[PDB]
Amino acid sequence: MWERDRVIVLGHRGYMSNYPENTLLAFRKAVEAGADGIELDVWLTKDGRVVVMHDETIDRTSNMKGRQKDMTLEELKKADVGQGERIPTLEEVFEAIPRNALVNVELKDRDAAREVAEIVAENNPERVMISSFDIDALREYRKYDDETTMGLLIDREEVVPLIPKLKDELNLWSVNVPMEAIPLIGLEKTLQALHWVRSLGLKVVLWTENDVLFYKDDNLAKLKGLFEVVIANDVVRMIEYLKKLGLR
Ligand SMILES: [Mg+2]
């Protein structure tokens, strides 16, 4: 399911450019706009529920304050996360979108690993990908699920040398890396790094801050053929760009 000819487009926290991030509304809209799937962030509540929130706290996206790890689900459901949307549980999300929609669950909380794995098992795990910046979260997830597709998010240069070992340890499908690499080490070195990871047998998932580096200098086009998935805030804009390049 993650291995396919057509480049995969995921809405970052749903169609977050046009709808409130990490909401059922945003998720539905992304898929309704033609995205292959969604990406989202999860944490474990004080009562053992898996909830969708990017930040460690609800302050930025909600009308309320607090750390979700320190709240119950019921407390959490008080909040307004945009346009009357409530913070969803992971199960709520699977219910909301098609059964074959791709879902990249980003584990923000190692404590959530076991629950996430159980829910995933019940919800067409073949279309699921687990990723994290936190290697320990990934290691914990592997205690409970050794089959589901896994990606390593990277934003530190020093992590890169570790990739071969991590791949073997975690059985990674992909590394999930930022367009920010280009201004950082230059396009050519970025191309070389991508070749390196591919030489390991890894696939590649691309992301950036607020979609800006995908389009600047036509950076994304330069990477043609070296990536299998893109995570984008503006789903439609990304789909249009890919069509223009003959990739959609
Ligand atoms: Mg995320």
Write the CATH number for 142: 3.20.20.190
Q: Which residues have their alpha-adjacent CB atom under 5 A from ion ligand 1? A: 41, 106
Task: Report the separation in Å between the CA atom of 48 and the middle of ligand 1, taken as the mean of its atom positions.
Answer: 20
Place of tokens 């098609």: 98
For residue 132, give the amino acid letter. Answer: S
CA distance 165 to 60: 36
Which approach determined this entry?
X-ray
Residue for token pair 């043609």: 224
Q: Is 5 annotated as a binding residue?
A: no
Could you give the number of structural domains in the chain? 1
Q: 3-state class of 180 per DSSP?
A: coil
Q: Which helix (H) or strand (E) holds 176?
A: strand 174-178
Does residue 15 contact residue 80 with C-beta atoms inside 8 Å? Answer: no
Count Cβ atoms within 10 A of the Cβ of residue 103 and give its class: 0-12 exposed, 13-18 middle, 19 or more buried: buried
Instruction: Let me know: does 103 contact 95? Beta carbons within 8 Å.
Output: no
Tokens matching residue 74: 């019921």
Closest CA to 27 of 79, 105, 121, 117: 105
Gap positions in the chain, given as the residue before each gap (C–N > 2.5 A)?
A: none
Looking at 12, 13, 29, 142, which residue is catalytic?
A: 12
74 has binding-site annotation = no
Q: Which residues contact 53 (CB under 8 A, 6 or more apart)?
A: 22, 41, 42, 43, 61, 68, 87, 108
Other residues' Cβ atoms within 10 Å of the Cβ of residue 122? 10
> Does residue 52 contact residue 79 with C-beta atoms inside 8 Å?
no
Q: Interhelix angle for 163-170 vs 135-144, to 10°?
A: 20
| Two tokens, residue 10 | 């995921």
User: What b/e readout covers 172-190, taking b as 16+ CB neighbours within 10 angstroms?
Assistant: bbbbbbbbebbeeeeeeeb
By residue range, what is the domain housing residue 39? Answer: 1-248
160 exposed, middle or buried (CB, 10 Å; 0-12, 13-18, 19+)? Answer: middle
Q: Count the residues in the chain.
A: 248
Report which of 95, 94, 114, 91 is spatially closest to residue 103, judged by C-alpha positions: 94
Q: Name which of 207, 221, 143 is nearest 12 in CA terms.
A: 207
Q: Is residue 217 left, alpha or beta, with left meaning phi > 0 and alpha meaning psi from -120 to 50? A: left
Adjacent-strand bridge partners of 151: 131, 174
For the record, the structure tokens of 122 come out as 């019940």
Which resolution in angstroms does this entry have? 1.9
* Angle in degrees, 0-180, between the axes of helices 113-121 and 135-144, rounded to the nearest 10: 50
